[PDB]
Amino acid sequence: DVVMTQSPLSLAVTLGQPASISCRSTQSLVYSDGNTYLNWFQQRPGQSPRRLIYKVSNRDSGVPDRFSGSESGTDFTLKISRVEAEDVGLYYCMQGTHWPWTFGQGTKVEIKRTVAAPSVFIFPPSDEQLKSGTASVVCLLNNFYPREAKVQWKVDNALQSGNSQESVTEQDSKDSTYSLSSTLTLSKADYEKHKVYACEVTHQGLSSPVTKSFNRGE
Amino acid sequence: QVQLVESGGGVVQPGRSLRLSCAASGFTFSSYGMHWVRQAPGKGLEWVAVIWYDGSYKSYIESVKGRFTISRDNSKNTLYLQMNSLRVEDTAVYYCALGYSSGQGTLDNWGQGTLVTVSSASTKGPSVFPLAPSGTAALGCLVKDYFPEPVTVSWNSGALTSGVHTFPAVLQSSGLYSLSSVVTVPSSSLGTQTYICNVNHKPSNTKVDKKVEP
């Protein structure tokens, strides 16, 4: 099979800056008709792929002109001249010269924006959930940049270990921020034996850690 | 327009079979070759198979040869992928795809995909619990303990979209997924305004509406 190798696998670039993705081929993609059948696809989260370039450098109709494609023999290159916020997503190359047709591994494009501190909210378990014996406590970090963030849980001021889980949205395609949820999981019996539940958030946008907390029973 | 709609994906035990179909319309379907491309969750696109416009020539990836058969019925405008001896590595979203303006060495039209989960686990619907709020407030719903993906979550029957984050599902140590959906709103609305999240887990035919109150 023809092996398409892409680089970089992940690419972070600040708005307005250029960006380029390269693809290399273990075999020539020149077909007997003299064309090179190298394609570039964009794919946004939860969306079918959308072709940007075919035959190395032809831009698809309705694809903006900041996208271009070229070949250096050494490799094939997708270029975005001025990176815009809506360009988050994955990008794949595809050769259709040899069967089986093959893609590269893909390249993820993150926007580098200015630092944005998160807004932080805490949510106690619901009385409905508590009736089946397990408690979920939720801490929300809203609209922050960059993605790196530390979320620590404290119960009656005792630091928790191993009983929380994190999820992070895809980079918003408009303001280029992230959001994050941290879920602390307890038994009802352990929940009811303590009063203060706190999530402590440190982030590059915050000059001191932010603690949001509630008292069980208020 | 050109429209492809895949169906047939679901939970299937390893070693069992599954027939995927893709329904085509809007174009002369019997003049175009048809392709299957899959994407494991969070992994990359992978071309799988092609069938000629008349069904003569077919071609497969080696990893599926002997197990998968591509076929089509031109009289029904329908593409098929027959999958036998399914492995866990076959878990993916399967797209059907074609090259319309030109089919030579390219693809330019895709379906929305159907998810095939190769797992011995049981389908289980979620439990929905409110995230009750304390300038801007936040509230949400916790969608917990379901299998397989996916769930959708809208707010107020889709009338509320600004400010909504639905987090990617996380797989817990139990083998069940859990996610939260949140929205940010003005604090002054919390005693004026109703907030209902609408959870749908089609694999278990679960529909749940939870009111989130302060």
Partner: peptide, 8 residues
């Protein structure tokens, strides 16, 4: 096998 599965 050519790399166009369409009708000519």
């Amino acid at each position: 096998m050519p790399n166009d599965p369409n009708r000519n």
